[PDB]
Write a protein that binds this DNA or RNA. Structure first.
Ligand SMILES: [Zn+2]
Ligand SMILES: [Zn+2]
Ligand SMILES: [Zn+2]
Lengths: 90, 105, 90, 90, 90, 90, 90
DNA sequence: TTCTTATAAATAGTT
DNA sequence: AAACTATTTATAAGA
DNA sequence: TCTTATAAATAGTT
DNA sequence: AAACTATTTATAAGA
DNA sequence: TTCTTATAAATAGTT
DNA sequence: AACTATTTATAAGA
């Protein structure tokens, strides 16, 4: 961007909205590419600050989510805290 | 004089009590008869011996209601998560059912 | 990258697997950034080609999906084809 | 009191209730004083006629119940019938 | 009593025990009377300073203990501090 | 078998022990086959004449019992009485 | 039967229910004969693929479950995986 | 004891 | 559920 | 231990 | 709902 | 909401 | 993995 931004909440309401929409599309585009490049299945669920829902899936959403509930082995599970630590080492 | 049903629930409740104590006990010289054996079982965090399945049994009974986001009871937090997962699964199967009832008509 | 690629399945196993790990991290990174910058909750579920689970959620995964199951209003739901179309338009 | 009463269920609803609250405090007072005077641990559990719970403890209730559960020696245990006979012999 | 006693730990072990025994018996008599007069279920557990157990239950102890572990709503829970406050107000 | 036997208590101790070990194994085999064939969760608890415990569970005994205790809806329950009558109908 | 079947999940729902009803009675009948012939207490709990409950017990179910819970001794415990090995090693 | 066999009992397939 | 059978499986005895 | 003078709890009522 | 007080009850100190 | 583009961020192919 | 040359994303202002 014209300027680097830090990853902390955007306080200007207008700006935050413009950013959500633009970065949300960019996220879905990356997810689409990952699903095609590497033959995988992806479901993405996003609730904005007003609790409106936005969603993407490379196949039927409900099937991916059921497959998640049926999974029973340890596996990579990241959260906002986890990813913070990870970047701090790198 | 209590029904075998109540009496089994009481027995499970007491085992639970015993497990939640041994989970938070830092007193190496504890005088509670079951503490030592129980702390030994808990220390089966070695992953893998005395089956961990027995322990997860008790935790399950416990997990039904341990509310603190930070229980020290082996597996509690994990079991609470799997119970939410299961609840999600029912919801998904229901919605899926409805879409097909609608589709088949 | 050193070279532009087409979004088509990567057939070489080593390349596919290296690309997966890398881009999966990149997608989680962007999801993290979107949830912090714009104050939203996000769930991301990925199954790789061998049906192994990788996941990320801003807050508790199950709570977001639960909230998802309660939604009952029309909303943006995108698939691979919708994204291809949006890409072509530009 | 103004009059001596018999230890028998109080029939009048209003009397029973008022007496219940008064004597209950009196019992907790006595348990409080005993715990301090004699340095002991006391748990008191009371269900009323309409099955509401009232509890008193001079220390953590759950620790007292667990020590009780594992107490593995003969000890004094009284019931109502026991106490009746104990006073009958005076 | 032949004199008022303050509510403070009795230092003399013999006197501590003598006081314990009288007041223990007095507490169980009061509890007995409460349960009869007001038709309620009461359990009383007492460990003395040398950790000997003394117990009273109007009806069976295990029964009252089961119901107690099952109770899952608001109920008054009192401690020594709680009783001291109530005493002071007067 | 070489001959048909009547369904009534085996009075010869040795003969009763032999039969028990054999049929116990058959009963467990049948339980195993039903849970695999029909995708179900089964628990079998057996106390023999000398009061020893033998158990089968398709995966975990305590998971079934837990699910048993929480189940609250009319269900087929059969006793020796119920089963005799169904066998006589035939 | 007309044809030997392999012990693997029956995938067709109608056929699975046919075999289930049939084999469940067979199982409950074997359990009954075992209990009478050899004088044991038996409890059997079955959840089918759609989580409906069926149960048998030679006596009161609750009595059997209590006796199980309070048994504190090593004892034979078989699982589907166990019984697989024993059968394979032949 | 463990290990056959002859048979009784169960069940798959099909109505 | 309830009929058939034809086969297979379990198991009382015999080895 | 069993008493006794004296403190404390409390039934009826206000 | 808490307050009064005439009684009844509990119990401290001492045999 | 778009667009423009300077600049930051991601990542394909190389070591 | 670790490193870069290059492609892709996007922040700010119009
Ligand atoms: Zn301890
Ligand atoms: Zn283990
Ligand atoms: Zn817990």
């Amino acid at each position: 961007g014209r300027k680097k931004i830090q990853i902390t909440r955007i306080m200007d309401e207008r700006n935050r909205q413009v950013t959500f929409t633009k970065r949300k599309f960019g996220l879905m585009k990356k997810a689409y590419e990952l699903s095609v490049l590497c033959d995988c299945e992806i479901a993405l669920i996003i609730f904005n600050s007003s609790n409106k829902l936005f969603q993407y899936a490379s196949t039927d959403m409900d099937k991916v989510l059921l497959k998640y509930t049926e999974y029973n082995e340890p596996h990579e599970s990241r959260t906002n805290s986890d990813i913070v630590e990870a970047l701090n080492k790198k | 004089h209590m029904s075998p049903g109540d009496s089994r629930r009481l027995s499970i409740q007491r085992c639970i009590q015993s497990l939640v104590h041994a989970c938070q006990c830092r007193n190496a010289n504890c005088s509670l008869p079951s503490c030592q054996k129980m702390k030994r079982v808990v220390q089966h965090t070695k992953g893998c011996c005395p089956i961990c399945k027995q322990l997860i049994a008790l935790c399950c009974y416990h997990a039904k209601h341990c509310q603190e986001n930070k229980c020290p009871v082996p597996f509690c937090l994990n079991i609470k998560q799997k119970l939410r997962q299961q609840q999600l699964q029912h919801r998904l199967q229901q919605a899926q059912m409805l879409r097909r009832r609608m589709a088949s008509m």
